[PDB]
Amino acid sequence: HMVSVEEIRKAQRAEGPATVMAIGTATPPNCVDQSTYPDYYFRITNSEHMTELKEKFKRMCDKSMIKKRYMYLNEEILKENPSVCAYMAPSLDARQDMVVVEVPKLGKEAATKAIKEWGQPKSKITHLIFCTTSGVDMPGADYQLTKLLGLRPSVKRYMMYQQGCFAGGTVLRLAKDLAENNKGARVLVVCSEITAVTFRGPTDTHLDSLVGQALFGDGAAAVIVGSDPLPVEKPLFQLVWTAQTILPDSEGAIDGHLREVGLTFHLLKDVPGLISKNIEKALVEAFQPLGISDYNSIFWIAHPGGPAILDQVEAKLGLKPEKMEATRHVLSEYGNMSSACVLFILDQMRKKSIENGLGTTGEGLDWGVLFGFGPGLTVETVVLRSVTL
Amino acid sequence: MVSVEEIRKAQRAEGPATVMAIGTATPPNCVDQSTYPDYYFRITNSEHMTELKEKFKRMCDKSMIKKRYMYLNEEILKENPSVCAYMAPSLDARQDMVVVEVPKLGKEAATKAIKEWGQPKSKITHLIFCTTSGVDMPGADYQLTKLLGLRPSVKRYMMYQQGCFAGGTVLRLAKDLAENNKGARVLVVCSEITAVTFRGPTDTHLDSLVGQALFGDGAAAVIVGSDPLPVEKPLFQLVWTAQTILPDSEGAIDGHLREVGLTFHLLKDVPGLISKNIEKALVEAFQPLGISDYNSIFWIAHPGGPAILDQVEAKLGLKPEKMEATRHVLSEYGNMSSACVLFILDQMRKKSIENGLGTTGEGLDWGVLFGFGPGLTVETVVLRSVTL
Ligand SMILES: O=C1C[C@@H](c2ccc(O)cc2)Oc2cc(O)cc(O)c21
Numbered sequence A: 001h002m003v004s005v006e007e008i009r010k011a012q013r014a015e016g017p018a019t020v021m022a023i024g025t026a027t028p029p030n031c032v033d034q035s036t037y038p039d040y041y042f043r044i045t046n047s048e049h050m051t052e053l054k055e056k057f058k059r060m061c062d063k064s065m066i067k068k069r070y071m072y073l074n075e076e077i078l079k080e081n082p083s084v085c086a087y088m089a090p091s092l093d094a095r096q097d098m099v100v101v102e103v104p105k106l107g108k109e110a111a112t113k114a115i116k117e118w119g120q121p122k123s124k125i126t127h128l129i130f131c132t133t134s135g136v137d138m139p140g141a142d143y144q145l146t147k148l149l150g151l152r153p154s155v156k157r158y159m160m161y162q163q164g165c166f167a168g169g170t171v172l173r174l175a176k177d178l179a180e181n182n183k184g185a186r187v188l189v190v191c192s193e194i195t196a197v198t199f200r201g202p203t204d205t206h207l208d209s210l211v212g213q214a215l216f217g218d219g220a221a222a223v224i225v226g227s228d229p230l231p232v233e234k235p236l237f238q239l240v241w242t243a244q245t246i247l248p249d250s251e252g253a254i255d256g257h258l259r260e261v262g263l264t265f266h267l268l269k270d271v272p273g274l275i276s277k278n279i280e281k282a283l284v285e286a287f288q289p290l291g292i293s294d295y296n297s298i299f300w301i302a303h304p305g306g307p308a309i310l311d312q313v314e315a316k317l318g319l320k321p322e323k324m325e326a327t328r329h330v331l332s333e334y335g336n337m338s339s340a341c342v343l344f345i346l347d348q349m350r351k352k353s354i355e356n357g358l359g360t361t362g363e364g365l366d367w368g369v370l371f372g373f374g375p376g377l378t379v380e381t382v383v384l385r386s387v388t389l
Numbered sequence B: 001m002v003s004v005e006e007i008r009k010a011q012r013a014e015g016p017a018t019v020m021a022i023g024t025a026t027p028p029n030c031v032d033q034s035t036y037p038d039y040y041f042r043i044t045n046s047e048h049m050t051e052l053k054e055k056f057k058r059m060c061d062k063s064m065i066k067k068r069y070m071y072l073n074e075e076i077l078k079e080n081p082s083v084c085a086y087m088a089p090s091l092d093a094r095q096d097m098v099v100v101e102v103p104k105l106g107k108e109a110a111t112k113a114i115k116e117w118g119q120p121k122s123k124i125t126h127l128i129f130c131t132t133s134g135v136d137m138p139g140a141d142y143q144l145t146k147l148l149g150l151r152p153s154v155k156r157y158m159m160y161q162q163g164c165f166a167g168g169t170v171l172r173l174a175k176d177l178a179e180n181n182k183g184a185r186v187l188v189v190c191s192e193i194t195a196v197t198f199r200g201p202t203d204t205h206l207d208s209l210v211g212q213a214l215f216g217d218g219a220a221a222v223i224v225g226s227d228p229l230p231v232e233k234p235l236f237q238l239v240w241t242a243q244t245i246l247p248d249s250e251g252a253i254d255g256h257l258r259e260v261g262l263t264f265h266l267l268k269d270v271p272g273l274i275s276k277n278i279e280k281a282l283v284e285a286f287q288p289l290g291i292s293d294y295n296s297i298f299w300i301a302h303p304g305g306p307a308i309l310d311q312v313e314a315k316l317g318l319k320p321e322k323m324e325a326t327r328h329v330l331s332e333y334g335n336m337s338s339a340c341v342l343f344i345l346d347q348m349r350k351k352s353i354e355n356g357l358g359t360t361g362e363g364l365d366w367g368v369l370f371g372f373g374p375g376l377t378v379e380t381v382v383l384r385s386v387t388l
């Protein structure tokens, strides 16, 4: 009998939808209270003389709706690395030396927790997606994680570098196709973000760089995705449908350049306005084929780039104020952790749904949406289905 | 009532992922290997290192490269002397070049793939962009989307700092995108520019010098899709894929992006580690197909350098014809990192047509494509040819 490509294809593919079976999260230990951050930040960057700029930064922090963030960087590391405390001193080598180690380390912490929840042998992991906006190396963070966890050497890896804030959507869009197209496939997904690449001193000339110093936090999240769950596996969410789009008239709204001074952040145009103007079109594309037009009838995960995005989306669509609760909770307790945020928010929604005895992992609702927002301006959409509790 | 199970059955494709187009592009500056030691030691103001230049000449003579294409030229190097230093802060100058040049060269390859495919570019649903040359946000995938005028809703996979195995990685990814999504048409672009790694010579790091003899510039693009239309023209089917880390290979190929640019480090014996492990990779790929004669399949191997090809050929007993397409690309283009195996797939189709052979795979049915790179990572793709 001569084996054909059509035979192989039929035997190779999975049957059912991609299913989230575990979520784990991790943060660096140094907890940074937002209410005292202007005083800490102006002191460690030797900027106490800039009293007007410090006032502007206090207003940014006060408006952020962030209570605390976790940071790998602490006073001791900043004292050892004064190039990082300047506005634009040569500092990429110092920042790389930190993040090429700490990004996979924090990833491993999140991944161990996801694997524990999943309750299967790590030898059954067939695919690894590693996503970061913090540093690059060869071999990559995917290779480093494979060694730290002792995954099979034949794990199929997808190394997603320099992605930015929409990529929590991207990794679920990729994991969906890996799980669905490959019988038995189990996909470990890790997003790990460390602000050591982007931390720098303040200047009046670049108030967009300063906004970043108020919002960005550190964290890592991991999920396990697979089709055709075993009886001993415990589904949390199904991945139903995905999209990625570039918003019209958004050119240069969010740019990030990796330079000898590290990663620099640049803002033009009105990000909250552009996202609000365009979000309904994205929802119709996702939900009109499912017969859904009431956006208060679905559970919400939105990347909290800042509070203004969430406020203007809520106001544009007339969401009840409860829809954004899980999202605002993560923003409040962790800040903007770039690609990892939306995965923290998925965990928080499951946890709150359990605590409050709701019927499903999606706050008692059946259908949900997850949005990533970032450079492009790029919007990632993922349609989700909850599981009954 | 619409169910997720009904959505999944309607959403997915039926047939195997099929390569439907290949296009390639290079920068215009052609650099002859026979004169490269004189050129390189002159534009780096290194003519006084006479013993090192003799070592570099021997490296160029053993490379089995006849020529390379380079974005970098004498004018650009005189404008950017920090790039000509062995180790001077120079990443901003390098980034300024590659963040523009990578998507520009990628566009040139993509336009040619799209021309061969013969369909409207509005039907491209997915874009994979792959480079080892620079990073930016938004990425080269965004820049290429804008340059080509693809649909704003194209689904993008930006594959940065990938290294030399990623020619296999982008096919492994394209396969799942095409096969899981009814109607999906995947544009795949690998674009590599050595402005990120070019640097002056020293005698302390002979591994950095080996890079200066082997690495060239180039971009390649493919269209991948399942369930071809009658008006599409298949070239190859993507059958099966694998990625693995070789045992005892830790630190064999490291590359660090620093203030001096991208630095290349070699430990261990790369040709030896690949040769020692290549039969295990072939057995995993081909024993389920009932194939054990590795002279009966067509070959595409990443030409990391000539020693890798020589030692795999000697270990397996490949006939000298097997590595011909691979050696032809190494000779005419050098090591173009991730793009190199796509140039070789094009070369094999082209020679098959020219010589009137029965299939795009040199008249053979089954084939293997190997990527080799940092890890030490080996990518394996099993290919099926199409009849001519
Ligand atoms: O400059 C940065 C910092 C980066 C980041 C955030 C959090 C973290 O923990 C690590 C890195 O996220 C970004 C995301 C962007 O879309 C644009 C940017 O310019 C940046």
Ligand SMILES: O=C1C[C@@H](c2ccc(O)cc2)Oc2cc(O)cc(O)c21
Binding pocket: A138, B132, B133, B163, B164, B192, B193, B194, B195, B196, B197, B215, B216, B217, B218, B253, B254, B255, B256, B262, B263, B264, B265, B335, B336, B337, B373, B374
């Ligand atoms: O430092 C480089 C240069 C890079 C490259 C090659 C060709 C090209 O055209 C552009 C970049 O490829 C690499 C591939 C590696 O596995 C390790 C490396 O260190 C490098």
